[PDB]
């Protein structure tokens, strides 16, 4: 159905009315989202169907129609924009300077912006508009606030 490049909402009619479970990026004919949003299930786009192609529960990422296409990375210095697409509200760019998630396997950028769980899959962008990762997988701090990692896949 609709394969135009851009940010999309991931919806469901299983619960009461229509509910936004997440968000994703359509790029180069491939739909990219977080695994916990779809659980690997097929998606509908108008009258067309999007079947999963690649997924991994640990990276919490999934691609539809083709392999992961997003390859840009945060440079460790610059501010970034979270293109937040929240449930029932318009898409909105929120600029922030990312912090760090220090892990046993290396450092990862992290955005400290709080949004509902249905915002999962919202793209994080660099100054050229390139997707450097997706928002939706992180942790809950002392504050009760949510700090998400800048989760990026690997392009083959």
């Amino acid at each position: 159905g609709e394969t135009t490049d851009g940010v999309y909402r991931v919806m469901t009619r299983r619960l009461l009315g229509s509910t936004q479970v997440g968000v994703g990026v359509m790029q180069e004919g491939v739909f990219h989202t977080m695994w916990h949003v779809t659980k690997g299930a097929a998606l509908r786009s108008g009258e067309g169907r999007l079947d999963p192609y690649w997924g991994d529960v640990k990276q919490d990422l999934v691609s539809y129609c083709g392999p992961w296409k997003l390859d840009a990375a945060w440079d460790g210095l610059s501010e970034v924009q979270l293109l937040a697409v929240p449930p029932g509200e318009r898409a909105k760019n929120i600029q922030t300077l990312p912090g760090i998630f220090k892990t046993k396997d290396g450092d990862i950028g992290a955005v400290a912006l709080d949004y509902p769980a249905g915002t999962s899959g919202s793209p994080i962008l660099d100054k050229c508009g390139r997707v450097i990762g997706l928002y939706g997988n992180g942790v809950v701090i002392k504050n009760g606030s949510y700090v998400s990692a800048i989760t990026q896949g690997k392009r083959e």
């Binding site: 490049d5 299983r14 922030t96 912090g99």
Partner: protein, 39 residues
């Protein structure tokens, strides 16, 4: 059955609302893709 709806273009917006802090957090990632706080 899940479905998708376009929500906009992927562009950088000059003069966007600049907010949010930059914390350095010690974390762990389990086999189920869940992060946790190491203290």
């Amino acid at each position: 059955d899940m479905y998708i709806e376009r929500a906009g273009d992927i562009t950088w917006e000059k003069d966007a609302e600049v907010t949010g802090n930059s914390p350095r957090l010690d974390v762990a990632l389990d086999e189920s893709g869940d992060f946790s706080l190491v203290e």
